[PDB]
Amino acid sequence: MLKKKQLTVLDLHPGAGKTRRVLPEIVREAIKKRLRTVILAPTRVVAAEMEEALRGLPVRYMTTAVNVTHSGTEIVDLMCHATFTSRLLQPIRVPNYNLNIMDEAHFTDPSSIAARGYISTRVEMGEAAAIFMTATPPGTRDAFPDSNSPIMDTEVEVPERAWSSGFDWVTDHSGKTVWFVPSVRNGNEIAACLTKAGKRVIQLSRKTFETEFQKTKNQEWDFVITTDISEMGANFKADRVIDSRRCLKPVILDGERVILAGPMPVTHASAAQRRGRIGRNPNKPGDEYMYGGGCAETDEGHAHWLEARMLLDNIYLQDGLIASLYRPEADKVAAIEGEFKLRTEQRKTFVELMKRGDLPVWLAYQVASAGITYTDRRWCFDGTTNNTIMEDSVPAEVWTKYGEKRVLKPRWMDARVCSDHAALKSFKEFAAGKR
Ligand SMILES: CC(=O)c1cccc(NC(=O)N2CCOCC2)c1
């Protein structure tokens, strides 16, 4: 695998040992061959699991998720997918790694897609080797891959709202269930219904994942209600997955606004990763996968691939050259390589709106490309009446940095800034000048 100009897809089935058995063998061989190596974890939770798998090997943990005193002599670096892309975008030297290892390489967040595009372009240039570790590479069509033990697959109507009757099988179960929902708001309603029925529920989403995931180890629970973030190498001691088989799709309308379309079917890759949370113990056959819909290739036209192009257009590669998306995922967007390349000061603004502003890539791009500076929040208030953000069926209001109460009416509307109470709270703080 370790030869320059090689990209290997390590596509062993979920639970086959890619992280705990194969990765340490790859790292030992890379160190023997003096390959400057990066290992990319999708989440801080996976970063910590990797430290355990790699313990004693000379690896530099570029993450506060691990508390280890480093020698200063490591040639292997470990960081999150997002950290890799972030450092490429910033005016910081990222080593030209000889070997690029991406764990949970199916991750479809924009920074992960961009990282794959940059890495696969360096490999195509003859500059580097790469290993993408995933059971479900891009365009996989198999929702039911092999497992460590047999899975009971059942197509069944799955509730997406509170229920009073007609789903006894949900609550009649005595084991532990991981339940994939399409949104935080949908999980909140199901979680409340289960809580009312006497169940112990933990909810996981991107913003809460590290903190709340620890509760799955520290407390007894009956259900984990999770969004798609638990597709990325989250492991549970569970005997059932309930899968809505639904997700939200960010869609850019008319180059002008982003909506969260759906819920709509998941991809085959997502369905396989959701299912792959169970059947992992060869000694515990008959784990259950209850699924409530079909699969479809809903990554086609999904904003994350256009956002990945916005990131890659703003990463230096060589002179004016621009990294391509990884070939198998390159048709998911209609985009011209370089169309989103920003001049130096607008690029800095773009980066800060993502890094400090915590804005979605698309929205950060609209603001930066309009020639607005990072601290200028006038655009949060001067949109059309139809861009009014609503909070409990009334227009959201904030005090501006000038001390004026105004309706939140952003010039560019991206549904991700108000997808749930926590998102809208964060965006209100942004509009107010509080970060
Ligand atoms: C984003 C982030 O957390 C980050 C970013 C850059 C560097 C590091 N830390 C290191 O380079 N390590 C670990 C600490 O002490 C020895 C060297 C962490």
Are the C-beta atoms of residues 148 and 281 closer than 8 Å to each other? yes
* CB neighbourhood size of 199 (10 A): 16
Pairing of strands 287-291, 240-243: parallel
For residue 63, the ligand 1 atom closest to its alpha carbon is: 3
SS (H, E, C) 155-210: ECCCCCCCCCCCCHHHHHCCCCEEEECCCHHHHHHHHHHHHHCCCCEEEECCCCHH
Region at 202 (left for phi over 0; alpha for psi -120 to 50; beta for the rest): beta
**Å from CA of 220 to ligand 1 middle:** 34
**Å from CA of 71 to ligand 1 middle:** 13
Going by alpha carbons, the residue nearest to atom 1 of ligand 1 is: 63
Going by alpha carbons, the residue nearest to atom 18 of ligand 1 is: 62
Going by alpha carbons, the residue nearest to atom 2 of ligand 1 is: 63
In degrees and rounded to multiples of 5, residue 156 shows phi and psi of -155, 150
17 carries a ligand binding annotation: yes
Using only the alpha carbons of the chain, give its radius of gyration.
Answer: 22
Q: Which residues pair with 61 in a beta bridge?
A: 78
Retrieve residue 93's tokens: 């030297």
**Strands lying side by side in the sheet with 129-133:** 7-10, 129-133, 99-103, 37-41, 76-80, 59-61
User: Rounded to an integer, what is the distance from CA 245 to the centroid of its chain?
Assistant: 17
What resolution in angstroms, rounded to 1 decimal? 1.5
**C-alpha closest to that of 203 among 224, 183, 185, 221:** 224
Residue for token digits 């501006």?
400
18 carries a ligand binding annotation: yes
Are the C-beta atoms of residues 188 and 164 closer than 8 Å to each other? no
Q: Which residues pair with 260 in a beta bridge?
A: 250
Helix-then-strand count for the chain, H and E: 12, 18
- In short, whether 64's Cβ falls inside 6 Å of ligand 1 is yes
∠ Cα 32 35 37 (to 5°): 115
User: Rounded to an integer, what is the distance from CA 434 to the centroid of its chain?
Assistant: 26
Going by alpha carbons, the residue nearest to atom 15 of ligand 1 is: 70
**Å from CA of 343 to ligand 1 middle:** 29
- Measured CA to CA in angstroms, residue 101 lies from 23, 30, 78, 214 at distances of 9, 11, 9, 26
Alpha carbon distance 308, 325 (integer Å):
8
19 carries a ligand binding annotation: yes
Are the C-beta atoms of residues 27 and 2 closer than 8 Å to each other? no
Retrieve residue 214's tokens: 């620890």
Alpha carbon distance 386, 425 (integer Å):
20
**C-alpha closest to that of 289 among 265, 266, 311, 271:** 271
Instruction: State yes or no: cis peptide before 263, omega within 30 of 0.
Output: yes
13 carries a ligand binding annotation: yes
Retrieve residue 141's tokens: 């069509």
Pairing of strands 394-395, 390-391: antiparallel
Retrieve residue 98's tokens: 């000889």
Going by alpha carbons, the residue nearest to atom 11 of ligand 1 is: 62
Are the C-beta atoms of residues 43 and 211 closer than 8 Å to each other? no
- In short, whether 70's Cβ falls inside 6 Å of ligand 1 is yes
Count Cα neighbours of 88 within 13 Å in the Cβ-side half-sphere.
Answer: 28
Retrieve residue 267's tokens: 């991809």
- In short, whether 66's Cβ falls inside 6 Å of ligand 1 is no
Are the C-beta atoms of residues 311 and 361 closer than 8 Å to each other? yes
- In short, whether 61's Cβ falls inside 6 Å of ligand 1 is yes
**C-alpha closest to that of 110 among 249, 269, 312:** 312
Going by alpha carbons, the residue nearest to atom 9 of ligand 1 is: 62
Q: Which fold has domain 7-133?
A: Rossmann fold (3.40.50)
Alpha carbon distance 342, 346 (integer Å):
6
Q: Going by CATH, does the domain composed of 152-291 fall within 3.40.50.300?
A: yes
Region at 141 (left for phi over 0; alpha for psi -120 to 50; beta for the rest): alpha
Alpha carbon distance 435, 430 (integer Å):
6
Are the C-beta atoms of residues 257 and 362 closer than 8 Å to each other? no
Retrieve residue 87's tokens: 């450092």
Residue from 40, 62, 71 whose mutation best tests the ligand 1 pocket (most atoms within 8 A of CB): 62
- The H or E element containing residue 300 is none
**C-alpha closest to that of 310 among 234, 414, 426:** 414
- In short, whether 69's Cβ falls inside 6 Å of ligand 1 is no
Alpha carbon distance 38, 56 (integer Å):
17
> What amino acid is encoded at 278 in this protein?
I
**Å from CA of 43 to ligand 1 middle:** 15
- In short, whether 83's Cβ falls inside 6 Å of ligand 1 is yes
**Å from CA of 63 to ligand 1 middle:** 6
Residue from 59, 61, 76, 78 whose mutation best tests the ligand 1 pocket (most atoms within 8 A of CB): 61
Q: Is 399 helix (H, G, I), strand (E, B) or coil?
A: strand
Q: Is 108 helix (H, G, I), strand (E, B) or coil?
A: coil
Are the C-beta atoms of residues 75 and 31 closer than 8 Å to each other? yes
Are the C-beta atoms of residues 370 and 379 closer than 8 Å to each other? yes
Query: At a CB cut-off of 8 Å and minimum separation 6, what does 328 contact?
Result: 137, 138, 139
N-terminal to C-terminal alpha carbon distance within the chain: 44
Going by alpha carbons, the residue nearest to atom 7 of ligand 1 is: 62
DSSP calls for 327-353: GGGGGGS---TTTTPPPHHHHHHHHHH
Q: After which residues is the chain broken (C to N over 2.5 A)?
A: none
For residue 80, the ligand 1 atom closest to its alpha carbon is: 1
Query: At a CB cut-off of 8 Å and minimum separation 6, what does 251 contact?
Result: 258, 259, 260, 261, 301, 302, 303
**C-alpha closest to that of 213 among 199, 227, 196:** 227
2 carries a ligand binding annotation: no
The total number of residues written for the chain in this structure: 435
- In short, whether 60's Cβ falls inside 6 Å of ligand 1 is yes
363 carries a ligand binding annotation: no
Exposed (0-12), middle (13-18) or buried (19+): which is 388, by Cβ within 10 Å?
middle
**C-alpha closest to that of 112 among 98, 102, 125:** 102
Exposed (0-12), middle (13-18) or buried (19+): which is 198, by Cβ within 10 Å?
exposed
* CB neighbourhood size of 283 (10 A): 6
Solved using:
X-ray
Alpha carbon distance 27, 2 (integer Å):
10
Alpha carbon distance 173, 156 (integer Å):
15
For residue 66, the ligand 1 atom closest to its alpha carbon is: 13
